[PDB]
Structures are given as C-alpha cells and as structure tokens.
C-alpha cells in the first residue's frame, strides 16, 4: 500500500463497458484506444510500454494560447513568443519544485504518455470521430488547457482532500469539457479489436496501477 506521487509512472486500466488498458496507435497517430484482447491485470499485454503514463502537475498555457492565436505586428508576435518561452521555463521550474508531492482527490493533473512524450488532451470543440455525441481525446506534444484532469473518487469511501492510494479506481474528469473519459464500445475500422476513448458522461472507472516511482 502506497500513495500516488507526482512524477510516478502509472498505468490506467479501464473497468466499464469495455475492460482494458489505454493504448496508442503506432506511428504519428494521435488516437487513444483500449484493446480488451491485448491483456488484463493478471496477464498484461506483451507491448507494455504504450500503456505507461506519468503524472504531472497543472501547467499554465495562457501566454502560449495567446501567442498561437496571434500567429494564426511582428514586434507583438516576437514579444508573445518570448512570453510563451518564459512561461514554458516557469512551468518546467514549477514541475521540478512540485516533483514528488502527493496527489489528492479533486486535484488537477496531467497524463504524459512517455513513449510518444505527449500529454493526453480533450478538445471540447471537436466531436469524436465515431461517437458524434462525445468529444475528442487525443495526444498533444506542447499541450493545452484540455490536458487538465480532475482526479475524482469513484468509490464512496474516498472523499475530496484525501490522498490517492495506488490500485484505486478513479474518474478523470476534464476541467473544461467537464465530462468523464469514456471507453466506448465502438471499434475502429482501421484497427480490429481496438476501442475508442472519448469524453462523455458514463460510469467508466480507471484503476491506477503503479509501475515505477519518482525516487526510482
């Protein structure tokens, strides 16, 4: 028994309509999928590196978003770029300083997929490819405000402000979209046996399995 610390490498096991780990398609694809037939908790999938995520603290993207909006006047753009770089440095320093802190229920976190080195993001302005009634979950290198995720309890024996214990089932609720991640039953045409991950109200829960710690 141990608590969840910022910087730990963890795996998420969906236990809802479809049971399986969170995986990402190879190449430069930015789609998160769940493959129930790949493996389970007792028999993890052979390729047990695409399902590993790292917990990171909240980051500030106001200056970066403003710079992107301006880019999409030369002096203003250059100063916005400088401000964005300074904000990135400040975020890196804050991550280094907050490294090793315990994660509490109701707190905002980010999930960095290590193999692709990309933050998991949810876009509230883009419907999902298959389930048109759900929003789109993807992976972004730089990241945006959609990477924020409230780590909410799933069981009633856990309350806000309590430390997260390894092995618990939790809910990852995007701050902006406001609808928990859902492992839909839709199957991708391109890849067989894989199920989509989107953002829509459901009863899905994610079990947190510890793989490595920050001190290790």
């Amino acid at each position: 028994s141990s608590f969840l610390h910022i910087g730990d490498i963890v795996s998420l096991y969906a236990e809802g309509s479809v049971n399986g780990f969170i995986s990402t398609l190879g190449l430069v694809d930015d789609r998160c999928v769940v493959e129930p037939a790949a493996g389970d908790l007792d028999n993890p999938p052979k390729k047990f590196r695409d399902c590993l995520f790292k917990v990171c603290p909240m980051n500030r993207y106001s200056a970066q978003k403003q710079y992107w909006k301006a880019k999409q006047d030369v002096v203003l753009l250059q100063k916005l770029q400088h401000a964005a770089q300074m904000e990135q440095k400040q975020n890196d320093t804050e991550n280094k300083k907050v490294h090793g802190d315990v994660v509490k229920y109701g707190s905002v976190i980010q999930l960095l997929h290590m193999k692709s080195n990309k933050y998991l993001t949810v876009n509230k302005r883009l419907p999902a490819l298959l389930e048109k009634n759900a929003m789109r979950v993807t992976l972004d290198a730089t990241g945006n405000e959609g990477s924020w995720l409230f780590i909410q309890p799933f069981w009633k024996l856990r309350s806000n402000g309590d430390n997260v214990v390894v092995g618990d089932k939790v809910i990852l609720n995007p701050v902006n979209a406001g609808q928990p991640l859902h492992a839909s039953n839709y199957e991708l045409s391109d890849n067989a046996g894989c199920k989509e991950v989107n953002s829509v109200n459901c009863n899905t829960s994610w079990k947190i399995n510890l793989f490595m710690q920050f001190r290790d």
Binding site: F3, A63, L157
Partner: protein, 1549 residues
Amino acid sequence: HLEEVLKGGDVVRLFHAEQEKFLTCDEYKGKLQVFLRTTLRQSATSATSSNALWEVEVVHHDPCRGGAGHWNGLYRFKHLATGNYLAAEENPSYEKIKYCLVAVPHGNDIASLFELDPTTLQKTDSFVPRNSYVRLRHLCTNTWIQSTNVPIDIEEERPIRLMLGTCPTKEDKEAFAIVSVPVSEIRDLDFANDASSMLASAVEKLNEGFISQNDRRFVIQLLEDLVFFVSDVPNNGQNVLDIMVTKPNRERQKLMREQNILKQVFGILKAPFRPLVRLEELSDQKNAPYQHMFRLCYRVLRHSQEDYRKNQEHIAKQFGMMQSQIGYDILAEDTITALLHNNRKLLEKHITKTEVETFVSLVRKNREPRFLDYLSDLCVSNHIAIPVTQELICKCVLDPKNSDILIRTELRPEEVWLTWTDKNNEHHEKSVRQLAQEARAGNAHDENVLSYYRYQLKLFARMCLDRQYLAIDEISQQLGVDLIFLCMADEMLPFDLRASFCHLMLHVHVDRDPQELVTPVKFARLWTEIPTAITIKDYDSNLNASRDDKKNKFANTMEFVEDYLNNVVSEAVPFANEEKNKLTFEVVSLAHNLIYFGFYSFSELLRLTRTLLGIIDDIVVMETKLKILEILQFILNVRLDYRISYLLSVFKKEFVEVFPNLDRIGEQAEAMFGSMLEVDDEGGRMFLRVLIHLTMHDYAPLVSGALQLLFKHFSQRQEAMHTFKQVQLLISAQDVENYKVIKSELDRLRTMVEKSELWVDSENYQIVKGILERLNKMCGVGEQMRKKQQRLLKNMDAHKVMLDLLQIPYDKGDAKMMEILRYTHQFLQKFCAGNPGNQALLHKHLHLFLTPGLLEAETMQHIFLNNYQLCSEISEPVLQHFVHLLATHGRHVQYLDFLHTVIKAEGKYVKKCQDMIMTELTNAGDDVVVFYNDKASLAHLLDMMKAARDGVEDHSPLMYHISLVDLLAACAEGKNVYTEIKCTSLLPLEDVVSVVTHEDCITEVKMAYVNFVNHCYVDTEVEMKEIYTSNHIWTLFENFTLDMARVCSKREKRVADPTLEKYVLSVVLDTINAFFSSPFSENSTSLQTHQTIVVQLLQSTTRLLECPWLQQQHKGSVEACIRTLAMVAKGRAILLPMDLDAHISSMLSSGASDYKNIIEKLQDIITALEERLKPLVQAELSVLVDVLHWPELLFLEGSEAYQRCESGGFLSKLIQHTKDLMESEEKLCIKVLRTLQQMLLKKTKYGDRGNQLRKMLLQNYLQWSAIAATQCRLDKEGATKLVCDLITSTKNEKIFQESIGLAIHLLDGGNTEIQKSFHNLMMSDKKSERFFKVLHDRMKRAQQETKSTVMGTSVLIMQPILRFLQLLCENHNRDLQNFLRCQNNKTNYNLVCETLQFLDIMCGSTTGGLGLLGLYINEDNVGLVIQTLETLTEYCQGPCHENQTCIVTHESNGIDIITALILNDISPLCKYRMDLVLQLKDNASKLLLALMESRHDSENAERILISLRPQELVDVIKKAYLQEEERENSEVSPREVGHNIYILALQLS
C-alpha cells in the same frame, strides 16, 4: 480508556457506504435475519434504528478482559437489542455467495470471529480509530463480506431487507464505517428491552390464566414507568394517568414501536377478554386494578402516537379492539380522539355512521360532556373542518329522533329558559340566571348542566364551522340573533358561557351569505360619483349606501363589543383574569370578522383603533394581539383610501372650477399629512410605543407584524402617491356601462361559485357558460382598448374569481364542466395578453397550473409569453415538470411550444434557459427526442409528409417533430459548443439533405431543416466545420435554386404559395448570406461544378430581384444577398454572362449612389405632487432613523420597557429576529438592512420644508466620533455576526449585497474594534471556511465572466467585496492581512492571489500588458481597476513581507500589468477622462512603492525593473511634469503623480 479509539463493549453502527445503508438484524418470519435496511429518507445517515446497534467485543485469552482493539486482533459483534452474535453459515442455494451472514444465539464458537482490514495506510497496527472505514473478514472460512441486491423479503411489497454474503475474493469498495452511538440511546434501548421482556412474561402469564397479586402490582409499576419514560417528564409525584407533554420524544416513540412494546400492550389489553375479566365486571372494586392497568396501557398508546404518522397508523391497525373497548371507564375514547384528530386520512377512513351512532348512544346513556367534546373534536382536524365527518355528525345529532340529548332554549316574557331531560326521562326547565346563580353558590347539578350546555354550544359552533349550511339552517331557528345577543350581553352569566355564545355568534350568523370580504382600496372610481367636497361623514354615508343591506342586524352586537372593549381598557391591567381572556379573544375575533366583512364606518373604526391601542398599552393574548394588528392594518388601508378619495375630490373641484391651482392642490394634499385622521390621540406616539412593545415580544408573527407596521408608518406619502398613480376614472359612458356590466356579472359569478356544492354535481351550468361567454366578448379585440379592458378587469378583481372557479371541486366526466373550465382558461389567457402586470399577477399563483393538461400548458405559455423578466427567472422545477410530463404522459406539442416561448422572449435569448432545456432533453433520452434517421424511420417520415401534403394537423407527430427541430435550433443558436455538437450528432447533415431533396417533403419540414442547418452548422465554434469542404451544401443550394424557380413559376401562373414565399425569403437567403459571408468559404468556390452553381444562384437571385411581386421589406435582404454573392463570384473570378454582369454592375452602382384633457391634467397633477412631496418622503423616512436610534424616549423613565430600550434590547431583538425572518420575509430583511445602513450613514440635509417637517416630527415623537460610536454600539448588539451569518448562509443577491454594504459601513474609517471583532469571529467560528469559500467562488465566477466578455452582476459586485477587504485590512492590521492570505483552517483560499488574477485578466493579460492595455480599460471598469489597485496597496502596506513576495513572484505576472499601467497611456480614455488615467497611474505607483518598503534585498527591485525600462520611466516623468493643461479644474494634479513616479525611480535606482 481513550475516547478516540475503538474499545471493547462499545456500541456502534455499521454503515455500508456503497449501498448507503445500516446493518440491521430483525425477525422476519419467526427467525432472526441480518440484512441492510433500505430507507426512503433523503439523508441515508439519519435512518438510525435501535436494531442497528452492535456491541464490539475483543477476544483475549482471559474471557473477563477486553482492552483497546488492534488491527491484527479478533473481534466479535453482538446484537445489543437481541443478544445474538453475528456469524456466517453455508448458503442454502449457492448464487455467487458461498456463505450468508446470520445471527447465531451463542458466540462461544469460532464461526463468529471477524478481523478488520484497513482501507488506507494507518500508523502501524497500534490502535483502531473510531469513525474509520474497515473491511470485515471471516477467519474460519477466510472470506470477505459484501452486499447484494437480493431481497430477503421478496414476497412482500416494498422490499427493504437486503442479503449480505461472504466471498473468497476481496472487494475494495465493500467497506463499513463505524458510527458512534449516544449513551442516551444506549440506555433507552436497554430500558426498552427490559420492559419488553417483562411485558412478554406478563402477557404469557395472563394468557395462561393465573396472575398473582405481586405480579399484577409489578406489571402496573412497569406500565407507570413506561408512561413516564415515553412522556419524558420528571416524576415529581403528579398523577401518572394525567400527564401533559409539550414535546413528544420521536426517538423514544420509534424505539417503543420497533422494540415490540406496543404489541405487548395490545396483547395485555386483549388477553383478559378472551375469561379472567369481563367488560361488564370492570366497575367492581375487585377488578379495579385491571381497570387501572388498562387505563395505563391506553395512556401509553396515546403517548406513543403524538405527532408520529407511522405510530398512528400502527395503532390504527388495531382500531377494531380499541372501538370494541369503548364506553367503559378505560379512557379508550380519549385515545381514539387523540388518534383521529390529527391524522385526516385515518379520520375519514375510520369514523363513519356506525361510530357516530355509537357515540350518540353513549352520550344518550351517560350524559357526560366529555363525549360531546370528543364529538366536536372529531369534526375538525388541524383547525380545518372535514366535510365528510362534519356532515355525518350533523345528520346524526340533529336527527329529530335524537332530540332528547340536546338542551333546548327559549325566550319568555325577556328572559332565557333552558329545558332538558334527565336520565329518568323527566323533563326539567329552569331560567339561565337562576342556573348561573345556583352554580356560583355551589349547586353541582346546575354546574353540570351549565357545562353540558357550554359543550353543546361548542359542538354546534364546530359543526357550523366553514359555513356548514346543513347545520346552520337548523341551528339558526333554534338560536336567533336576539337570543345570542341577550346571552352574551348578560353579565351575571359566566365568562366561559359568554365566550361560547360569542363563538357561536361568529360561526353561525356572521360567517354566512351574502357577507363577503371587502377591499378597503378601490382603484376604479366613477367621475359622476366624486363629490365636490368630502368629509368623514360623507365617506361613511357613501360606504353605507354602497352596502347592500339597509338595516344592520349586528348594530347591537357592535355596540356591545365597543362597550366591552371600553370596560376592558378601563381596568389598569386588561389581561389579568384567564376566564375573561377567552371572552375578550372571542369579542376581538368577532370584531375582526365584522370589520373584514365591512360593517363599520370610518369614525367607528377610528374609535375602535383608539380603544385597542389603549387595551394593548398567553397564547390567547398573542392571538388577540394578532387580531388587533390585522384590524389596525385594515383601518390604515381604509384611511389611505379616504385620502385618495379626498385627493380625487380636490382634483374634481379644481377642474370644474377652472373649466366650467397646482400650489393650492399641493397645499391641500399636504394639509392632511400631519388631524382627525390620526391613529391615536397622541399624534402617533401611542401607536409607535405599541409597535415597539409588540416587536419586543418573542412571538415571531407578532414581531413581524409590528415591524411591518413600523416600516409602513413612515411611508404614508410614498404609499399614497404609489396608490394614486394607479387610479382609473372611467369617464366615458361606454366605460361606465362596461363597469356596471362587469360588476353585475362578477357578482353573479362569485355568488354561483360560492353556492357551488348544490350545482357542481340544471340552469346553473347554462348561467355560468353564458356569463363566461359574455365576459370573453366584453374583453374585446384590438390593442386600442384591450389594455383598457385588461386594466378594468384587474381593478375589478376578476382574476381572483376565475382562480376560485378553476379551484372549484368537480368530478371527471362532466362535459359541461370541462366546457366552463375551458372558457375560464381562455378568459385567463386573454387577460394575460401583453400585460406584464397581469402576467405577474397570474404567475404569483403558478402552483395551480403545475398540473398535467393541455389547457394548463397553454395558460402557462400565455403567461410566460413575451415576458423577459419571468423568462429569465423561470425556476428549474417548472422545466423539470414539463420534461417529466413530456416523458411520461406523451409527446404533445404544447410542452414544446412552452419551452420555445421560454427560450425566446422579447427577441433576446436566455442562455440559462437554453442550456437547461438542452441538458434536460439530452438526459431524458430517446422517448422525447425522436429523430427519423434509419431507413424505416425515414420511410415513415416520408409517408407522413405525403399524407400531410395538403396541410399539417395542429396535433400530429409531424408537428411535434417540427417543433422539436425548431427548439433544438433555438438552443443551438446560443453560445454553447456541446449543444451544437449534440444537435449535429442527433441530426447528421446527410439525413438533412436526404429529407430536403426528396420530392415529397413539406415546406414546413424544409424550412425547419434549413434553419437547423443555419443555426447548427453554418455558425458554430466547432474547429472542424463539416458544412464546408463538402457537396451537401452545394446540393442544398441546388435545391434552393429549384425552389426559387418553382416560386417564380407559381407567381407567374397565379399559384402563389405563401408558405413557400416565406421560406424562400426568410431561411434560404439567410443561409446563403451566412455561408458566403464567412472566411472559411473562400476555398469552397474552387471546382467547376461549384462555379456553375454560383452562376445559377446569381441568375436566380437577379431574376427574383427583377420580379416586382417582392415586397419592400425583403428588398434590403435580397440586395445584401446579391451583393455578397456577386462579391464572392468576382473574388473567385467566375466567367459571368455579359448581360448578367452588366445588370449586377448597374444594381451595385444604383445601391452605391374632455376625457383627454381630464387625463392630461390628472397626469400633470400627479407629476407635480410627486416632485413636490419627494423631499418630504425622504424626511419622513429619515425620521425613522432617529426613532430607532432613541426608542427609549417614547416610553416613560423608570419603566421596565424604558430600561430595556436603554439597555439596547430593541436593537438586539431586531438583529436576532432579522436572521430568523431572513428565510421567511426576504423583503423585510432587506428593509431592515437598509434601515441599519441609513442609521450608520452620516447625517444630511434636505431643505427648508424638509427640515421643518423633520424637526416637527422629532418634537412630536421624541419629547467621525459619532459614527465610530454608532458602529461600536451596533457591533456590541451583534451586527458583525448578523452580516457574517447572512453572507455565509444566504442565496439571495439582494440580501448578499445588503450584508456587504452593512459590513462596509461598519468597517468604514478603519475601526479597529470592528476589525478585531471580525478577526475573532473568523478565527473562532467554524463558518469561516464557508465564508472564505463563498468569497472565493464569487471572485472566480467574476473572473470567468470577465474572461468570457474579453458589465454584468458578477463583475459589478466585485467592487463592494474589494472595498470590504480594503477596510478590513485598513490601518495596517497585520493579523487580518496574514489571515486573508492563509487561514489556520483545513482549507485556505488565497484572496490576494485571486485579486491579482482578476486584475491581470481585466487588464488584458500579456497582450494587454505588452502595449495593448488601452483596448481593455474602458470608462466603466476604470473604477473597479482603481479599487483593485487600492486593495492590493492596502495588502502590501504595513508592510506585509509575505504578501509582497507573493504578489511579486505570482505566476500570473501581474507586476508586468502594474508597470504597464504606469508606462503606457490609455489612448481611448486619455482624451476623454484624463483624471481617471492619472488616478490609475498614482495608484500603480503607490502599489509599487508599497511593494518595496521594508526590503533590503534586490529581488523585488530587479523584478520590477525587468518591466520598467528606465528610459521610458524618465520619459513619462518628464511628460507628466510638462502636462499642465489638464490641471485646470482637476482634483488630482499631474505634477503630484510625476513626483510620486520620480520617488519610485529614486528608490529603484
């Protein structure tokens, strides 16, 4: 023995959180079973039961030793209420459960051993803290416990018992919380168990047949102990058989019910009569102890059911035996009455003709007044008459057969004689005076006769209650008005008898027809009926003439009431004798009823007011005080009406004199506002003193009434003007005729409704239908007179009559009743048509229309139609009810129409309503949101459209679908992204095009789909816009061109279709313009097919413009569409035809190149009077401030009231009651808060007349250091706690704003005493968490709204909060400065960081601070920015190193914004209001200086210099010094700002 750990022998509850249920062990069928009990209570943790208590036993080697528990130890659980031990046994079936939990009798086996498993990381296996979640494992089988949904009591309604089971696999969510149990409950359970065991033994002995004397005495003692325990009253030697309880113990009642004690009581009452004792032998002294035992049992039953529905029903389940044991001296009828007097359901279910006849026979046999009292009580429940029981009792008692049980009365030559019949069938007659005299002497027979007569009168009055004509008609002849008047006027008769006579008079004669409530103020008056001169006598004569009755049959009654009140006030102490208090209350109630029915005159009302004030200066006393206050309010309303009549008479006199002035009319109006209209003879001193004394009472209704009257006393002028502004004259002859017709019809309809019961189940229906039709016709058509008719109806109060008619009871199936109801609904809808006042009046009674029904839905739609005020404030429950009706009853278009009307009103859309409706529709499912997307559904839709080709029925599935599509389009038209996404998913574009392009498609569906596409695809925030880069839109444009060609052909052939014309001229052009006026469409026009479609659109649109049939209204839209399309085509470089291009160029060049007089005079008079009297209104309102500041001067020195007022009791009581009335009277709370703010505010002046009025009123009534003293006094009284509680517990924006303002006024001047009081309250009280949380939430909401805008209530209310914080931290209060940053509580909110983030967001963030600061600081937010800067400066100063460091190193980089505020010029605002810019610069400089006061390190200096470039700083300093033109008439000189900036530069250098 620590109390913070789990110890052996402790009693706890095991609460399964996942199921949210307690673990219980109960006997279901002759066997104990363990389970989880399901509760319907909202709070699952409040479902505490005595059977859920478990005892924890720690297992050690020594059986006599316990000790604190350990996580690694073994535990046993014993059922404290039964003694059984929890254990597990083999599953009989073996589902997933292998073993099922049970309750074994002995706990010496290993099957009852359990061990705990913590759910988290504990501090080693040292101790088990209480109130900690645990998991239970069965050691013997090594299995973990879990819950299941299998009901044990499956073969019953409402299963509540759920089986648990142990499985070999552990579940983490299956955890139990340990809840502590009070020692009071533990002791109560122990006592109940012991009593139940003893009663069971006694019942067993009684059933056996032989009971010893000692056993019987022990049983009697146990019953007495149970009675005392249930009553919860100390045993001080009072008789057990007669105990009065002020507050029943619900916990003890529930324990008695659930421990099977009432069952034992019933067994005791039932066993003897099966024979040890017979009901016919209970009078024997030998069987007297059994009688006492039965009486004790019945007392226990009565005490176990007081104010407890469940216990009442449980006892009523055995009603047969309780009724079979009636009559004998056991007190069974008393229990029966106590049962069926508070529960209406059981009363009507049980009390019937058989019971009434049994009571009648019993009273015939015995003639005990108690039976008549019980009969009277059975007629009324909760002070409300029950028609069924009332009619039954009346028809049984007044039956001529049972005429020997009632005492008859007669008048002889007069004097009153009473005649009765004794049990020996002997007739007796005697005079009332002789009876009373002999009773006073001591004659027991006469006293009993008088008591019997009094109870008979009480029964008659209760039967006649609520206008029971069946009994009133029979009793009136027997007891006339003259007889009752003589009896009540007689003094020798006892006060109780006089009070009974008064009550009978009130409930027999006064409460009848045609007597009805009369409105003191009438808004409609006839010009011909306004006398030139009006006085009190003339007004009284006019009221008498208006009254229908010519001869008053209650004049003697009123005279007697006046004489009695005069006698009462003559005595020094009015409320001394309790017996006389009953008579006084009855007289006051009779006077109140007569006044409200309109039998008094103005002079009589004034005399009664003086008498009642003299009387004024315990429940009966409070009730009579409330009655007196109501009478006073009615008389004040009458006085206001008289003043209005006087003003009307003055206006008429002036108008007639000048047309066969303003100063004269104003002086005449001022004259009455002082002599003869005064409430009292002391010029209001007595009235004010009485109001204050009543406010000083602890009775909440009396305090509220006194406060309301006190507030209304100092607003006579304002209220008079407000009422005079709503006066209608009805000068025209047509208006007079309509007024007469409306009056007659309303009177007839109201009489018919009042006499409803005789025709609801006949010409009455025809009369009602004719009246309704005539009223509907009279309402009129045409806005020219529709407003006049609606105002006349509002003044005549037809809406109340219509609401009463709607509320009339009826039975389903009556077509005529349905028709009249429909007519009433139509009348209400027409009445609420374009009149916001009428709409609000109807909405005030909304609860009536919250029932299923198409008529009700239409009425709601009409009420909410085109009313933004109500549409924006519509409540969530209404929408939830409408959605539930749609889901359950069916799919009806009325609900969709109501939803659309709520969404759109007065053009502007309601974002809240849109979002709420969309969310509700999404959550409802597919049963209300039906779309035809599949092949079969599309075929069905095509078939329906083909069938509806000629037209669409008003109620049809096609109409419902169209309404749903329109509603979704309206919802998506707002500013929500998920709504648009959901709409697109529900209706894919492919389905839209397939439906539209189909040859068989109605124009309504086409228009709905086109509007849906326009509002959900063309205009959206979705980054991936599917409308573009697709051929669906091009196909839709081709269909639009085909439709245009069809319209042109039809117009040429004279087959014009208005629907098609409206569609093409409304939605097609709008969609085309929206599509072609967007940047994303630039790449769309690329392909050759797209170019050809563009050319087709060009030719079609130019042909449409050329065709002359188009109206002038759409010419602008057509021209705009043509210009946009031509611009797009030219940008795309399309080879247009030569003639078409020439015509387009030509079009572009062309485009580029005496009742009226009476009303007017009345309006002018109203305006002049208001303008002249406003200062006097202000002065009169202000006088209340001094009255509340010095309330003790009204009383006389040396009195108890004077001492209480001087000691600040008045203000303390007002403050304490303000919190109590906050929930009830929000308006009164707001008024009290405003009064406190005015009292805390500085004194001012109004003018010569205002000062004269103020000084005169002060003389008549009351025969910065000051502000600080007043603030300290209010703080001592408890204003700070009041404002804190209001802020932390209120939901009303007005209340929150008033609390903030009062706090600001208290903290004004930086009062250290109030600051310390606030700090102490915050640090001590546990509500500081809530206070800071709500402040943080409000600030975050304001920040979010500001960000979205980059105005509004949230943004505006920020400034008061910032001012409050600034005053809180004023004078360098380091304690509060640090507390606002960090709190010692568990959760801390950083208000400094929140304020800095708000400032950064409002200043434009990085883009604003990099040089675009001028585009965000407008003329409205400049004050808020200045206040924020001042608050930040106050935080920084003191100095506060922590706050300075936090602001400097905050992640939001607000220091850059602060520096930009100095180094940048707000160009838009500099050339308009330069002083505000100078103030902003000065505040920024002061904040920067405060950020570095007590700092020796260079961190802050370097951080500031990073943004402050020295060259720019010097340049701005020099510019400020040079600037001198603005100094002209400037509050702040630029030179001072430049000097401050120079000082900052020196410090930074």
